[PDB]
Amino acid sequence: KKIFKPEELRQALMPTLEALYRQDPESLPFRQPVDPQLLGIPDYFDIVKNPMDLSTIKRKLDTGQYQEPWQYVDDVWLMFNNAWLYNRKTSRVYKFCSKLAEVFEQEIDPVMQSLG
Numbered sequence: 001k002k003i004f005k006p007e008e009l010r011q012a013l014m015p016t017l018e019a020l021y022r023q024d025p026e027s028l029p030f031r032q033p034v035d036p037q038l039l040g041i042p043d044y045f046d047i048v049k050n051p052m053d054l055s056t057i058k059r060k061l062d063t064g065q066y067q068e069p070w071q072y073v074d075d076v077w078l079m080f081n082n083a084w085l086y087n088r089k090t091s092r093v094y095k096f097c098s099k100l101a102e103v104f105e106q107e108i109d110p111v112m113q114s115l116g
């Protein structure tokens with residue numbers, strides 16, 4: 001029954017999202033929604049039914065869509081899980097995803113401990 005105001009969540013969590021944006025080159029596939037037609041992967045939405053990317057998560061943070069820290073974390077991991085699902089383990093995007101997940105863990109673990 002602990003209440004998290006949107007400003008407090010945003011202040012605590014936005015640095016962890018910024019760390020993902022900063023990661024170069026590995027965030028490049030993740031900074032915008034997947035465009036299946038433009039990227040040449042027209043079957044994408046046949047596999048990924050709940051797309052998620054950094055810019056969608058940022059907008060939800062900026063508009064107070066997350067009431068709890070774990071709701072933000074779940075969207076970050078939805079982005080990772082989509083990329084590990086759609087892309088082969090031998091592929092650029094799967095490998096970039098794996099790196100982003102390691103970066104996110106380093107950032108989010110201390111923020112969680114201090115948020116409760």
Ligand SMILES: CCOc1ccc(C(C)=O)cc1NC(=O)c1cc(NC(=O)c2ccc(CN3CCN(C)CC3)o2)cc(-c2ccn(C)n2)c1
Binds near residue numbers: 029040
């Ligand atoms: C083909 C299939 O793709 C995909 C399949 C599946 C997925 C998902 C999420 O399941 C995602 C994708 N997406 C990508 O793989 C992708 C990859 C890049 N760039 C790189 O990986 C990269 C490494 C080094 C350089 C050189 N770079 C640097 C910057 N410099 C201005 C230019 C040269 O680029 C970029 C983009 C992208 C989309 C919009 N934008 C503005 N950028 C998308």
